[PDB]
Amino acid sequence: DLFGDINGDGIIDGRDATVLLTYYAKTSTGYKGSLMKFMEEQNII
């Protein structure tokens, strides 16, 4: 439900922002593969 709860932990905070930056950092280094795929590989979900 919550727009902007990227880690899907019910609330919107620091951690969500971290996910997006760390994601951006990966794509910026050649990482193909989506946000959900990344969050899985890094055990954020």
Partner: protein, 199 residues
């Protein structure tokens, strides 16, 4: 080393009129002898000037000569955040081969002047005279995402700032250094170096 840098095609593309005109300076270390150079770890600093309190969101590519060996942080990162990002609560260095990608974010424009990022690099024992190890800061874009240097709200001001940063704040193929070392190394797109001299 190669020129991974791209052309800044965002709009605005011309940053001269920008209220904030940030310049990134990269360490330039010179050794007199191969002797003093070999095995030495150089602290390479990516230091920003002219943007206290004027940026929030950041992200840019760093690269260096293949023959250098980065020494990672305790957590395996190739770069460690410096004093300028101390009030930016988000920072990340993602490893990238013979390079690293570094990115910032903050809850207001708490970007500071000073050392943004530190990178510990080490020289071969096969050091040689006149050797030049270029260190590049580079802009990279594609349709999925691009590099950044903007304020908390990506204002008109922010984008002018960003255009400056990449087109004029750093060196690229289209703003080349004339450093006698980066010339001797056809790495005029590069920004800093570790170097040694002839006899």
């Amino acid at each position: 080393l190669t020129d991974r840098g791209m052309t800044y095609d965002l709009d605005p593309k011309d940053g001269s009129s920008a209220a904030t005109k940030p310049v990134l300076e990269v360490t330039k270390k010179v050794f007199d002898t191969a002797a003093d150079a070999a095995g030495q770890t150089v602290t390479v600093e990516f230091k920003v000037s002219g943007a206290e309190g004027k940026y929030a969101t950041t992200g840019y590519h760093i690269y260096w000569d293949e023959r250098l060996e980065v020494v990672a942080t305790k957590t395996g990162a190739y770069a460690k955040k410096g004093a300028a990002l101390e009030d930016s609560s988000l920072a990340k260095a993602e490893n990238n081969g013979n390079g690293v990608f570094v990115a910032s974010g903050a809850d207001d424009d708490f970007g500071a002047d000073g050392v943004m990022w530190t990178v510990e690099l080490k020289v071969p024992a096969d050091a040689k005279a006149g050797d030049v190890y270029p260190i590049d800061v580079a802009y990279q874009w594609d349709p999925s995402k691009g590099d950044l240097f903007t304020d908390n709200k990506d204002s008109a001001q922010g984008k002018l700032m960003q255009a400056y940063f990449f087109t004029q704040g750093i060196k690229s193929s289209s703003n080349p250094s004339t450093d006698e070392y980066l010339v001797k190394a056809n790495a005029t797109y590069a920004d800093g170096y570790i170097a040694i001299k002839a006899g």
